[PDB]
């Protein structure tokens, strides 16, 4: 009977001393077992494993609490999905493009590249320590844990088509957006005026128009009575807003916005590019960089900087 000492963990901070029998698999001893994303469930302990840290599933009460405190989930499959993703994302390249961490194209990750690029241009603090820790490493160029977490939080596998608006929506649920406030006003000529106050995630996202200006002036929407009503922004308190719409030809003017997502293709299949406004317009497509004075393209998402807005109307 040969034994080695290893450490189990769910958070890669708190370690649990285990003595493993080298005659049985990790699976027979701990259940599903991963070594930096690699599934070692059906492998037997090698000598070179002595003193290494394995991720295991939260199989007792201490690990359930460690896992919850670090990731803010009790989804039974979360760590499996994280590990499975990490195994791929640690193989991706993360070049610095114009001082932002991007991702070299692989495994249909264009929506993640534009998400990662967007997150480095907006004021956002994550609540789950997993996201805080991984984001800090992502800003510095080691984005593999962050990208695998986005996949695990969003319940996406590597290779699956993602939507940038849906992805941002999940990440925003795990961000401190409690100070964010939006007041809308809906004028129908029959039904009269109706104010609505939105907080948190619903205060920074809108689907229907790409234009922050048009949202301030009013957009037409159908009222329950059947008339077109005008919905306009009365008050905005957020460090950013995100305007989203189905992809349409739209002209981005330098200095009028922070960054945007371009989508070419259809519902089922397509590609994202990222446009950022700096000294001029840069298009980032994974590792690729071009610039222009003006940009026209099928835009789906535009991010604007904000502090406080109050309507004059
Ligand atoms: Cl742990
Ligand atoms: Zn009405």
From Swiss-Prot:
Effect of residue 267 to G/T: Reduced inhibition by GRL-0617
Chain coiled-coil ranges: none
Effect of residue 91 to N: In strain: Beta/B.1.351
LRR repeat spans: 116-138
Membrane topology: Multi-pass membrane protein
Residues in C4-type zinc fingers: 188-225
Outcome after substituting residue 74 to A: Partial loss of ubiquitin cleavage in vitro; no effect on ISG15 cleavage in vitro
Subunit structure: May form homohexamers. Interacts with N protein.
Designated name of the protein: Papain-like protease nsp3
Organism: Severe acute respiratory syndrome coronavirus 2 (2019-nCoV)
């Amino acid at each position: 009977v040969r034994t080695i000492k290893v450490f189990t963990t769910v958070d890669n901070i708190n370690l649990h001393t285990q003595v493993v029998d080298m005659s049985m698999t990790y699976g027979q001893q701990f259940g599903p077992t991963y070594l930096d994303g690699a599934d070692v469930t059906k492998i037997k302990p090698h000598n070179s494993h002595e003193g290494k840290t394995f991720y295991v599933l939260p199989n007792d009460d201490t690990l359930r609490v460690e896992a919850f405190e670090y990731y803010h989930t009790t989804d039974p499959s979360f760590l499996g999905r994280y590990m499975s993703a990490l195994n791929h994302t640690k193989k991706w390249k993360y070049p610095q493009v114009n001082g932002l961490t991007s991702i070299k194209w692989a495994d249909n990750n264009s929506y993640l590249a534009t998400a990662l690029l967007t997150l480095q241009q907006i004021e956002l603090k994550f609540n789950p320590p997993a996201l805080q820790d991984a984001y800090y490493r992502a800003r510095a160029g080691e984005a593999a844990n962050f990208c695998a977490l986005i996949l695990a939080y969003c319940n996406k596998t590597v290779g699956e088509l993602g939507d940038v608006r849906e992805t941002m929506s999940y990440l925003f649920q795990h961000a401190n957006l409690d100070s964010c406030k939006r007041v809308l006003n809906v004028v129908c000529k029959t039904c009269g005026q109706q104010q609505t106050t939105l907080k948190g995630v619903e205060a920074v996202m809108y689907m229907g128009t790409l234009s922050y200006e048009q949202f301030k002036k009013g957009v037409q929407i159908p009222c329950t009575c059947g008339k077109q009503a005008t919905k306009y922004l009365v008050q905005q308190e957020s460090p950013f807003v995100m305007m989203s719409a189905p992809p349409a030809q739209y002209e981005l003017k330098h200095g009028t916005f922070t960054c945007a997502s371009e989508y070419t293709g259809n519902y089922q299949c397509g590609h994202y590019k990222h446009i950022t406004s700096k000294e001029t317009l840069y298009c980032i497509d994974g590792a690729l960089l071009t610039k222009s004075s003006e940009y026209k393209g099928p835009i789906t998402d535009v991010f604007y900087k904000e502090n406080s807005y109050t309507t004059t109307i």
